[PDB]
Design an enzyme around this catalytic site. Structure first.
Site, PDB file in Angstrom:
ATOM      1  N   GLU A  35       0.856  -1.055   0.048  1.00  0.00           N
ATOM      2  CA  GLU A  35      -0.012   0.057  -0.223  1.00  0.00           C
ATOM      3  C   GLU A  35       0.895   1.144  -0.051  1.00  0.00           C
ATOM      4  O   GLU A  35       0.394   2.256  -0.739  1.00  0.00           O
ATOM      5  CB  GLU A  35      -0.839   0.079   1.269  1.00  0.00           C
ATOM      6  CG  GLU A  35      -2.171  -0.856   1.207  1.00  0.00           C
ATOM      7  CD  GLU A  35      -3.078  -0.462   0.073  1.00  0.00           C
ATOM      8  OE1 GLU A  35      -3.043   0.691  -0.666  1.00  0.00           O
ATOM      9  OE2 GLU A  35      -3.904  -1.409  -0.309  1.00  0.00           O
ATOM     10  N   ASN A  46      -7.531  10.271  -5.642  1.00  0.00           N
ATOM     11  CA  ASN A  46      -8.288   9.809  -6.524  1.00  0.00           C
ATOM     12  C   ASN A  46      -9.088  10.774  -7.513  1.00  0.00           C
ATOM     13  O   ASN A  46     -10.330  11.169  -6.909  1.00  0.00           O
ATOM     14  CB  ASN A  46      -9.316   8.662  -6.000  1.00  0.00           C
ATOM     15  CG  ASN A  46      -8.281   7.702  -5.150  1.00  0.00           C
ATOM     16  OD1 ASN A  46      -7.378   7.007  -5.678  1.00  0.00           O
ATOM     17  ND2 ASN A  46      -8.748   7.480  -3.827  1.00  0.00           N
ATOM     18  N   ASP A  49     -13.187   9.874  -8.220  1.00  0.00           N
ATOM     19  CA  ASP A  49     -14.222  10.104  -7.445  1.00  0.00           C
ATOM     20  C   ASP A  49     -14.027  11.236  -6.182  1.00  0.00           C
ATOM     21  O   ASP A  49     -14.801  11.278  -5.443  1.00  0.00           O
ATOM     22  CB  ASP A  49     -14.766   8.666  -6.740  1.00  0.00           C
ATOM     23  CG  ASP A  49     -13.979   8.300  -5.486  1.00  0.00           C
ATOM     24  OD1 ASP A  49     -12.623   8.723  -5.169  1.00  0.00           O
ATOM     25  OD2 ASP A  49     -14.473   7.589  -4.632  1.00  0.00           O
ATOM     26  N   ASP A  53      -6.601   8.723  -0.531  1.00  0.00           N
ATOM     27  CA  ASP A  53      -5.995   7.530   0.573  1.00  0.00           C
ATOM     28  C   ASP A  53      -5.117   8.146   1.343  1.00  0.00           C
ATOM     29  O   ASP A  53      -4.045   8.735   0.981  1.00  0.00           O
ATOM     30  CB  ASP A  53      -5.339   6.473  -0.493  1.00  0.00           C
ATOM     31  CG  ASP A  53      -6.447   5.996  -1.406  1.00  0.00           C
ATOM     32  OD1 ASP A  53      -7.305   5.772  -1.222  1.00  0.00           O
ATOM     33  OD2 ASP A  53      -5.992   5.760  -2.661  1.00  0.00           O
ATOM     34  N   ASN A  60      -8.902   5.014   2.839  1.00  0.00           N
ATOM     35  CA  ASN A  60      -9.892   6.019   2.153  1.00  0.00           C
ATOM     36  C   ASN A  60     -10.918   6.901   2.724  1.00  0.00           C
ATOM     37  O   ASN A  60     -11.605   6.322   3.475  1.00  0.00           O
ATOM     38  CB  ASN A  60     -10.573   5.439   0.728  1.00  0.00           C
ATOM     39  CG  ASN A  60     -11.176   6.166  -0.147  1.00  0.00           C
ATOM     40  OD1 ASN A  60     -12.343   6.551  -0.194  1.00  0.00           O
ATOM     41  ND2 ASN A  60     -10.484   6.454  -1.141  1.00  0.00           N
TER      42      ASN A  60
END
Ligand code: NA
Length: 130
Positions: A35, A46, A49, A53, A60
């Site tokens: 990760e 991101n 949308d 993160d 998220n």
């Protein structure tokens, strides 16, 4: 903070992650590794949308933490996403436990399914004294 492998394995173990809801330590290490490369200040926006993160587990903002700028998001961990960017990972661990308390378990993270699931993860904790 960028943890060294064994340093993180012991830290996670002290925070009660070994076997939490059936998830072994090697699994959490594989997750953190893939990760963020064990980096607590790792972030990812991101654009698709409008979520982001945060931290070592790249949690998220749409469902878990509040950053004030994600449309119609919720805060299941009841934390500011800032809490997930600290060198001290206590809060990130409490939120990671909250994540796995849901139906999906460790499968919540796609990276886990891609790089850890049905794989030999033993190598992540070897030599760490855990
Ligand atoms: Na949120």
């Amino acid at each position: 903070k960028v943890f060294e492998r064994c340093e993180l394995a012991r830290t996670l173990k002290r925070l009660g992650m070994d076997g939490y809801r059936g998830i072994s330590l090697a699994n959490w290490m594989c997750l953190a590794k893939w990760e963020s490369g064990y980096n607590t200040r790792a972030t990812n926006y991101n654009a698709g949308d409008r979520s982001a993160d945060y931290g070592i587990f790249q949690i998220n903002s749409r469902y878990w933490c509040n950053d004030g700028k994600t449309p119609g998001a919720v805060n299941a961990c009841h934390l500011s996403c800032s809490a997930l960017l600290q060198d001290n990972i206590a809060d990130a661990v409490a939120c990671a436990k909250r994540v796995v308390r849901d139906p999906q378990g460790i499968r919540a993270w796609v990276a886990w399914r891609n790089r850890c699931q049905n794989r030999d993860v033993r190598q992540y904790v070897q030599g760490c004294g855990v």
